[PDB]
């Protein structure tokens, strides 16, 4: 997998060498094709994982993501052509390159055989992200948000560093292939009960768990649209990908060491879903929607039943695409409105007829409408959770009712009701804004036709 | 300085560490340490400002008593073994003295009070020498005697330094002292692995030298001893803003940059030796060091502090360039990580 | 560590014994990296000194890309030796002190009862 | 090119990684042994050199 | 030692006088000369860990 990567690196030379006026089209046009080369990995006629080479591999779980990581770079670069079009021609070429490095790094992290290669690349992605959030962040508080995003991930990260070096001494190689075909069975000691927490905690932090998710609402609030898309679509899912490949070892402990997180997540799912119900900042509501719909995932990567896992793989890819779509349209309202407040800007369909159709489809993806991969995902996690304990439906049942309420409230108070009297007149929709959306949903429609590709390792 | 004097002094400041390293007769190692003490004091008071005399008089007393303690260890050994050099048989207290003494000259842990203060009153230039070409000498003496020193003490001085360095740095706003504090911290990691794998001490030093030397020549390019002063870097010289950003995050352990390797292999070696107690606590507060590094990042790069009109005047005039060493030592430092296996 | 080994060359860079090892291919990815590492140093310099970044010092750019690379071949040539000594040393010991490193024979799975923790 | 290429490539990748793993562990055991046993080329700490012991005949007799 | 510029250069400015049994002025042997020899020709080729 060096075509999904080397051609990517070369994007950096192109963003720099290219003309200031033509820099945007060379980069966006080329990475669209970079995504097309990424689609070749999907050709898996057989079960055997495709081990491209010693360090680089792609198995069913990584492949559905590498393609998404390559896909969003085009979109990210199309959603940030407006803001970042007021810059000095060298601030742009920095932002474009920053976005380019994220997927170079993220493509490799999702396509990495050695778990510590994951760690080095895993924690590197913070550098590009922190720059995108802090350097271009509009609000006074991004310095703070950046600190929260760096420390919560970093304090979790050093325990994983110690744990992975620890298993290398215990087993003798951090190669995901071998670690899988070798006998690593923890022994339920008090210490192992700590190892397990060391490995999972760093992944559980960037996958916002109810206890440590305050970093994500603060980060996406002041982050520029491209950073918020990256955090929701690819960055948070780095934590999920890690939990799937790391729990191959630590096989016995999670049977009983998971209860704490599972309950934290399912109760967390309800409270995070509910506070979405009365949050005035739209970007705030989407972020907590992201916490709740990701709290379902940590509760399926821990129950560990075949269906959970691919419920997880289905939902992660699906929610990634949906969340961005929501964060992308939130930005289009923010740029014309100039405020994140949900109460202002009422009645837009009256003035932006189509963006409202995109808003409606994004919300229906947000809630579980049935001919969507989003529902298949939740339906499956729901099933397994029920298997874990029939009572789980109650808590995963209060979340579904709440999820319907906030998803439609975003449509009802942003895209319906009487028009706002006279905010700065709202200029019509650009074709870029609409495509950036179409590019998010057309793939959501196509993937829902053949869900098999994003089903995970389990199935 | 009459250029002749400059030569004699500089030769001594350079013959000082070199005799230490080359000789085996400890005595000759002691005088190497003594010559470094004598040579550095003249340069320290070059401005001869009231702050300076204070600096040198502290540096000298701290250095002198430690030098006398190191000599006492050699004198005691001479009686416990006729040899003029530490051996397997050496009484444990004899070696511990040498650790404390040498940890004072290097300024590690509970003897970390002199360094921040002398780093504050000396010029940026002599600051570098006082931080990096004066650590080579004592460390050489320790690295030579590693097989014999105590694993317990070193670790305590190691951990303490890491903490003191980190905590001290958080509050400081003067750059010279932020660096002094960082050096205390890095010096700590170095002395942690000495008992186990000296060869890594020599890596955690070089990398510190290849990181600090560019960082200081950056601070002086604009001769800013204040963060507020380095924050207006964007107006005085915009290009160094990019690398100053990476070098400081490299000084802390963040993974893509070269700075991770020293911490990573030291942790790998300590876990190989089973100190998974000690290594863990060190790595954790090591993370405190990055917080103050990033706070500076914020002021200098990620956010643009307001500047003064008189600055437009300094822009007009051609900026005297930074020596080539900056570049070669900025890149070899910010990004060599892809070449770690050979380095170790 | 590896110092104190018999025959150690007290101050030599790469003992002739390292002749026996294969020479590093000049295009070894690493030496090529050092090259790029170098070009960047050059470009960076131009930038910090405020010169046209790429179109200036085309002589220097060469000195850099060619100094770093030169250094590489002769360094890697050594680091390669050091690693090679490590095996010579390591493998030898495994034999000279055989009992301590005994070739164990594992049993096939048919015999090994591995515990099954039911997920349920 | 086929199912054959990846299956055979993956087995080659596993053999390199399996052999690297066994050796890395054996290093740690050899390095534990030579440190304590001091009977191997690594960890051979120095003692004075007999090349300076003066074996000459001293005027002072009896020694 | 740390940097053996002495062995390399072949010079011996610091080794000739590190133990009592080394050449004494006017060939006047120092005290204890009967043992240090016996204790360093023993520990020669045997590293410290096994000179102890």
């Amino acid at each position: 997998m060096l075509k999904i990567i080397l051609p990517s690196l070369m994007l950096l030379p192109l963003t720099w060498l290219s003309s200031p006026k033509k820099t945007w089209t060379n980069v966006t046009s080329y990475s669209f094709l970079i995504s097309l080369t990424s689609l070749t990995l999907l050709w898996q006629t057989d079960e055997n994982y495709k081990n491209f080479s010693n360090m680089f591999s792609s198995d069913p779980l990584s492949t559905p993501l590498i393609i998404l990581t390559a896909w969003l770079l085009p979109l990210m670069l199309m959603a940030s052509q407006n803001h970042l079009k007021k810059d000095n021609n060298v601030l742009q070429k920095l932002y474009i390159s920053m976005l380019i490095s994220l997927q170079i790094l993220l493509i490799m992290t999702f396509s990495a055989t050695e778990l510590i290669m994951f760690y080095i690349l895993f924690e590197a992605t913070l550098i590009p992200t922190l720059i995108i959030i802090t350097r271009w962040g509009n609000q006074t508080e991004r310095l703070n948000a950046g600190i929260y995003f760096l420390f919560y991930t970093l304090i979790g990260s050093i325990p994983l560093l110690i744990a992975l070096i620890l298993i290398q001494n215990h087993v003798g190689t951090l190669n995901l292939m071998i670690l899988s075909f070798t006998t690593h069975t923890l022994d339920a000691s008090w210490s192992n009960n700590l190892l397990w927490l060391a490995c999972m905690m760093a992944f559980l932090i960037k996958m916002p768990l109810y206890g440590v998710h305050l970093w994500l609402p603060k980060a996406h609030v002041e982050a520029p649209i491209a950073g918020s898309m990256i955090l929701a679509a690819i960055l948070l899912k780095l934590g999920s990908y890690g939990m799937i490949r790391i729990s191959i070892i630590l096989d016995p402990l999670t049977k009983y060491m998971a209860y704490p997180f599972i309950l934290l997540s399912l109760w967390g799912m309800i409270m995070t879903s509910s506070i979405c119900l009365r949050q005035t900042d739209l970007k705030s509501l989407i972020a907590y929607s992201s916490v709740s719909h990701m709290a379902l995932v940590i509760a399926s990567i821990m129950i560990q039943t075949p269906w959970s896992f691919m419920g997880a793989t289905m939902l992660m890819i699906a929610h990634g695409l949906t969340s961005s779509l929501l964060f992308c349209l939130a930005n289009s309202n923010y740029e014309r409105i100039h405020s994140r407040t949900m109460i202002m800007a009422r009645g837009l369909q009256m003035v932006f007829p189509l963006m409202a159709t995109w808003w409606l489809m994004a919300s229906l993806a947000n809630l579980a409408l049935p001919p969507s991969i989003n529902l298949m995902g939740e339906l499956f996690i729901t099933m397994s959770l029920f298997s874990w304990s029939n009572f789980t439906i109650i808590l995963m049942g209060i979340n579904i009712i709440i999820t319907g309420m906030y998803s439609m409230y975003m449509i009802i108070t942003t895209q319906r009701g009487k028009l706002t009297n006279h905010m700065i007149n709202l200029q019509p929709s650009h074709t870029r804004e609409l495509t950036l959306m179409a590019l998010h949903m057309i793939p959501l429609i196509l993937l829902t036709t053949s869900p098999k590709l994003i089903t995970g390792l389990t199935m | 300085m009459n250029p002749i004097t400059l030569a004699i002094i500089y030769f001594t400041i350079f013959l000082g560490p070199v005799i230490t390293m080359s000789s085996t007769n400890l005595m000759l190692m002691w005088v190497g340490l003594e010559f470094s003490l004598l040579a550095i004091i003249p340069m320290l008071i070059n401005k001869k400002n009231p702050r300076s005399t204070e600096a040198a008089t502290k540096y000298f007393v701290t250095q002198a008593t430690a030098s006398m303690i190191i000599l006492l260890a050699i004198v005691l050994n001479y009686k416990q073994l006729g040899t003029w050099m530490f051996q397997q048989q050496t009484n444990g207290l004899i070696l511990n003295m040498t650790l404390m003494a040498l940890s004072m000259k290097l300024g590690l842990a509970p003897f970390h009070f002199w360094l921040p203060e002398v780093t504050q009153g000396i010029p940026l230039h002599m600051g570098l020498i006082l931080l990096t070409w004066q650590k080579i000498a004592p460390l050489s003496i320790l690295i030579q005697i590693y097989p014999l020193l105590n694993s317990t003490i070193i670790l305590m001085l190691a951990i303490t330094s890491i903490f003191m360095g980190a905590w001290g740095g958080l509050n400081q706003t003067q750059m010279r002292k932020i660096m002094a504090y960082s050096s205390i911290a890095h010096m700590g990691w170095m002395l942690a692995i000495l008992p186990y794998n000296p060869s890594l001490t020599l890596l955690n030093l070089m990398i510190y030298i290849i990181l600090t030397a560019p960082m200081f020549m950056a601070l002086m390019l604009n001769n800013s001893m204040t963060i507020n002063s380095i924050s207006l870097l964007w107006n005085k010289t915009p290009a160094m803003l990019t690398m100053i950003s990476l070098m400081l995050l490299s000084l802390g352990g963040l993974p893509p940059l070269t700075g991770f390797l020293p911490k990573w292999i030291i942790i790998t070696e300590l876990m190989k030796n089973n100190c998974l107690i000690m290594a863990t606590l060190m790595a954790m507060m090591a993370l405190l060091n990055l917080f103050f590094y990033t706070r500076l990042i914020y002021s200098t790069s990620l956010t643009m502090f307001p500047t003064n009109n008189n600055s437009k005047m300094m822009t007009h005039q051609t900026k005297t360039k930074p020596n080539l060493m900056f570049s070669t030592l900025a890149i070899m430092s910010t990004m060599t990580l892809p070449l770690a296996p050979q380095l170790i | 560590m590896m110092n104190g080994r018999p025959g150690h060359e007290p101050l030599k860079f790469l003992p002739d014994e390292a002749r026996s090892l294969p020479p590093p291919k000049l295009n070894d990815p690493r030496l090529v990296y050092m090259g790029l590492l170098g070009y960047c140093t050059g470009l960076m310099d131009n930038m910090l000194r405020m010169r046209p970044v790429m179109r200036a010092g085309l002589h220097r750019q060469l000195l850099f890309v060619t100094s770093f690379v030169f250094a590489g071949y002769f360094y890697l040539k050594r680091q390669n030796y050091l690693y090679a000594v490590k095996d010579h040393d390591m493998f030898g010991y495994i034999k000279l002190h055989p009992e301590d490193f005994p070739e164990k024979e594992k049993k096939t799975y048919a015999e090994i009862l591995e515990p099954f923790h039911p997920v349920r | 090119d086929g199912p054959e290429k990846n299956y055979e490539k993956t087995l080659a990748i596993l053999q390199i990684e399996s052999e690297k793993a066994e050796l890395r562990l054996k290093e740690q055991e050899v390095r534990r042994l030579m440190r304590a046993r001091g009977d191997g080329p690594w960890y051979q700490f120095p003692t004075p050199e007999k090349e300076f012991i003066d074996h000459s005949p001293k005027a002072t007799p009896d020694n | 030692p740390f940097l053996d510029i002495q062995k390399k250069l072949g010079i011996s400015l610091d080794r000739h006088f590190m133990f009592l049994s080394a050449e004494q002025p006017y060939k006047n042997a120092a005290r204890c000369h009967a043992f240090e020899k016996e204790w360093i020709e023993c520990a020669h080729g045997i590293g410290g860990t096994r000179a102890k």
Binding site: - | - | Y83, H88 | - | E41
Partner: peptide, 27 residues
């Protein structure tokens, strides 16, 4: 009596086995 000199590792160097075996470096 005198002690026995440590034995001597013997042979010729051969390129290291599988290369630097550092974390994930095909080298």
């Amino acid at each position: 009596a005198r002690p026995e000199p440590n034995p001597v590792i013997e042979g010729d160097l051969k390129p290291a086995k599988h290369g630097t075996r550092f974390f994930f470096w095909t080298v």
